[PDB]
Amino acid sequence: MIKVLFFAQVRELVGTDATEVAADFPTVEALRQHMAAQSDRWALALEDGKLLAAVNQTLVSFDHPLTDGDEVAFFPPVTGG
């Protein structure tokens, strides 16, 4: 499974701190697009350009590959401010 963690406003908008997903996501982008299309609210939380992603504790770009066992953390960038 891939562990996906949500922090800060991402978490507060989507209603969960964590969810385990099947390992059927080739990249962070596939995972994000899949999750973003569940609802408008999800699309707001994971809006491209308003999102950062870390894989196994390293900040990566959305083209980064995912592998079974990976931990993915999604959280907002901040320029506050």
Partner: protein
Amino acid sequence: AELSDQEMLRYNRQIILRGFDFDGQEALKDSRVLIVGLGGLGCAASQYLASAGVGNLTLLDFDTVSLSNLQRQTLHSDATVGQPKVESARDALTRINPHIAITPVNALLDDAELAALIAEHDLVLDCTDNVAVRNQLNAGCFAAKVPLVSGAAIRMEGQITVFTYQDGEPCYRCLSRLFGEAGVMAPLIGVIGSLQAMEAIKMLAGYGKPASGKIVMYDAMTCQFREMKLMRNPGCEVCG
């Protein structure tokens, strides 16, 4: 630097820190730090840089104090609403520590002016509110190899990173390239600002290890701190 007897007593609790010592306190006295943005983060950071004994502070901001600022910018007060933030802050900081030199610059500077201003300091704090000024500072700091202690806060989330511009280390663009009013809770600015001050002291005195090559993210809603490694981005327009 030479500390006076009165300064040695004022800074006793720092001086007696083992690997800090008189040399570390003297390093602070001799330092010149540029703080850009005297809003929430800047008030929080500057108050502890001043109390700690950083000898020369330059305060840069173009904005004036407003009623809404007072919820979190504790150097400013109802009496200074309407005044330039740099003046209101200077007056407050000089009361916090009368031994230091504070230079307020009430201006919005261009790149040429920033290059000169950055080069004249040992370290720069980014306490601004927007990515345009932050990118400006990173560019100037990168060119002159002057460390940038960067803090940001919004809502219930804060972040800190230190850019030392060593070979192979990421810069702010390596991060900023990953993305493209709102509220903010008052003490969040205190947490991040104080971390900024801490990292600045550590860099000035060469004490401990700077928070470089990582983003430290504070999630205030759950009181969680996450450190995520920040790698240099190969083609980043600044350091690539």
